[PDB]
């Protein structure tokens, strides 16, 4: 508990940029793109207002567009007079991927027509397209193979406070060990994480802060319409914050909260708001109506674990169940607890042989052990129960490929 992330003071002009969405769409062979930026304002609407969206590649400006406010006619009452959409043509664009994280810089200038900059916001843009076609997840027309890991925000000394040094160390190590993806288990992360993934190159699964695992049954709250308001904000305010990041390729509705009607409403909400990214969610069977990807946790390669109501089928068997078409990427697999990771190669033989098996997210990155001190003042790695905490699930907090200090297992 506590104030565990950044605190800041932001001065904004009265007449301001209140929101901006960036999108990239492509011709069949990806040799042409239209960058579409929707900009929104607050304050007094005046004829003299403009928005200039310019697109930079290092120092070279490759595109620019300038328009006044007042969007297209939306419905019978008109349009959004406090909005504008800029559309920039981009020839032969440098594409973004975890392989080559090519980035552009988009500057959004709110200004008077006559050239008085009121204020400017900006972001790194990654020209890339994510779509699921014919049962396969595609980035830029090519089927991905998710070499991923689940990452909790953890530090042995600082707890859940994240810092740049640590975040960089994680990304260096992940990419050094042939990881190309990371799951935000199980909440929106520190803002700097998404920026780093944009720049170094990692496909991100951005996940809402909704976990109700200890409910009986697991979907007791998420099926409850009285809990919809609280849930929606955890989904909507996530999307509103991170939707501009190229590194984020998949949205997640949370983790281990069963399947409730609230998951359906919210799934639809993201599909309606953001057509660019597939929505996934594991609860209630990992193949429900709330997910575009079959995303089981700890489903084995060949062995069925056929629990009533929520079976964990062999991943090979799952794909070809009567009527099923969607891609399979496990949100959690290969529990790296203590001396583990036996049978790992079995997964990767399968991932490769089967097109619609597109990988997984190892559980998990770092051991959640905390530093404690003895009578001589010597540091030691502590787990569940070591702080007088009870009930506790003992050493189950340590399931990482690396120790708390980022030393490799």
Return the number of other C-beta atoms located less than 10 Å from residue 238's C-beta. Answer: 24
Binds its own copies by CB under 8 A, chosen from 295, 356, 364, 367: 356
- Binding residues for Mg ion, per CB under 5 A? 391-392
Q: Of residues 127, 399, 401, 402, which one binds Na ion by CB under 5 A?
A: 399
**Contact predicate 148/340, CB 8 Å:** no
Q: Give which of 19, 25, 56, 24 is closest to 38, Cα–Cα.
A: 19
- Minimum distance between the CB of residue 355 and Na ion, rounded to whole angstroms? 5
- Taking the least distance from each CB to Na ion, the nearer of 201 and 384 is 384
**Close Cβ partners of 191 (under 8 Å, ≥ 6 residues apart):** 6, 241
Comparing every residue's Cβ against Mg ion, the nearest one is 391
Candidate list 109, 153, 207, 332, residue with the active-site label: 332
Report the nearest approach of its own copies to the CB of residue 316 (Å). 6
- What does 113 interact with, of Mg ion, its own copies, Na ion, none (CB < 5 to 8 A by kind)? none
Structure tokens at 38: 């929707």
- Per CB under 8 A, the list member of 134, 177, 289, 305 interacting with its own copies is 134
- Calculate the alpha carbon distances from 113 to 11, 41, 69, 83, 107 in Å: 23, 15, 11, 16, 17
- Coil, strand or helix at 305: strand
Site string for its own copies, 291-310 (x = CB under 8 A): -------------x------
φ and ψ at 391, to 5 degrees?
A: -65, 150
Nearer to its own copies, 271 or 316 (CB): 316
Q: Which does 399 bind (CB under 5 to 8 A by kind): Mg ion, its own copies, Na ion, none?
A: Na ion
Beta-sheet strand order (sheet of 142-143): 130-133, 136-139, 142-143
Phi, psi values for residue 273, rounded to 5° = -75, -45
**Dihedral over alpha carbons 259, 264, 270, 272 (to 10 degrees):** 160
* From 256, 303, 324, 375, active-site residue: 256
The answer to whether 256 is a known catalytic residue is yes
Residue 332 annotated in active site: yes
- 304-343 positions binding its own copies, by CB under 8 A: 304, 314, 316-317, 319-325
Q: Which does 136 bind (CB under 5 to 8 A by kind): Mg ion, its own copies, Na ion, none?
A: its own copies
Contact at 8 Å (CB) between 164 and 92?
A: no
For residue 266, the tally of other CB atoms under 10 A from its CB is: 27
With CB under 5 to 8 Å by kind, the binding choice for 325 among Na ion, Mg ion, its own copies, none is its own copies
Strands 248-252 and 203-207: parallel
Q: Comparing C-alpha atoms, which of 245, 129, 153 is closest to residue 196?
A: 245
Q: Which does 391 bind (CB under 5 to 8 A by kind): Na ion, its own copies, Mg ion, none?
A: Mg ion
Q: Of 358-397, which residues contact Na ion (CB under 5 A)?
A: 358, 396
Closest CB to Mg ion among 213 and 409? 213
2 near its own copies, judged by CB under 8 A: no
In the block, residue with structure tokens 């056929």 = 306
Q: What residues act catalytically?
A: 256, 332
Interacting residue ranges for its own copies, rule: CB under 8 A? 134-136, 304, 314, 316-317, 319-325, 353-356
């Amino acid at each position: 508990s506590g104030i565990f992330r950044d605190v800041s003071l932001l001065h904004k002009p009265t007449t301001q940029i209140s929101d901006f969405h960036v999108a990239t769409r492509f011709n069949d062979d990806f040799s042409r793109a239209v960058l579409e930026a929707e900009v929104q304002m607050c304050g007094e609407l005046r004829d003299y207002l403009r928005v200039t969206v310019s697109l930079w590649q290092g120092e070279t400006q490759v595109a620019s567009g300038t328009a006044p406010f007042g969007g297209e006619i939306i419905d019978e009452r008109g349009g959004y007079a406090d909005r504008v959409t800029l559309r920039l043509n981009v020839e032969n664009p440098k594409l973004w991927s975890a392989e080559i994280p090519n980035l552009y810089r988009a500057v959004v200038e709110l200004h008077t027509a006559d050239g008085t900059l009121i204020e400017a916001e900006a972001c790194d843009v990654g020209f890339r397209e994510v779509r699921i076609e014919n049962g396969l997840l595609l980035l830029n027309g090519k089927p991905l193979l998710i070499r991923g890991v689940n990452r909790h925000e953890h530090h042995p000394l600082h707890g859940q406070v994240m810092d740049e040094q640590t975040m960089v160390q994680d990304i260096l190590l992940m990419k050094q060990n042939n990881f190309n993806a990371v799951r935000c288990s199980h909440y929106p992360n520190h803002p700097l994480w998404y920026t780093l993934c944009d720049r170094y190159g990692l496909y991100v699964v951005d996940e809402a802060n909704i976990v109700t695992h200890g409910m009986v049954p697991m979907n007791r709250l998420t099926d409850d319409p009285r809990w919809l308001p609280a849930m929606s904000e955890r989904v909507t305010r996530m999307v509103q914050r991170d939707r501009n990041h190229p590194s984020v390729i998949i949205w997640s509705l949370g983790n281990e909260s069963g399947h409730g009607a609230n998951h359906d409403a919210l799934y639809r909400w993201i599909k309606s708001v953001d057509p660019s990214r597939p929505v996934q969610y594991e609860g209630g069977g990992a193949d429900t109506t709330a997910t575009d990807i079959i995303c089981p946790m700890y489903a084995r390669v060949d062995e069925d674990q056929p629990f009533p109501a929520v079976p964990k089928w062999s991943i090979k068997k799952w794909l070809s169940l009567p009527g099923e078409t969607r891609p399979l990427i496990l949100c959690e697999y290969a529990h790296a607890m203590g001396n583990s990771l036996g049978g790992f190669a079995k997964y990767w033989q399968a991932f490769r042989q089967y097109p619609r098996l597109q990988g997984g997210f190892v559980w998990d990155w770092v051991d959640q052990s905390l530093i404690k001190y003895d009578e001589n003042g010597n540091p030691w790695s502590a787990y569940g129960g070591d702080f007088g905490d009870t009930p506790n699930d003992r050493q189950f907090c340590m399931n990482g490929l690396v120790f708390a200090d980022r030393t490799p297992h």
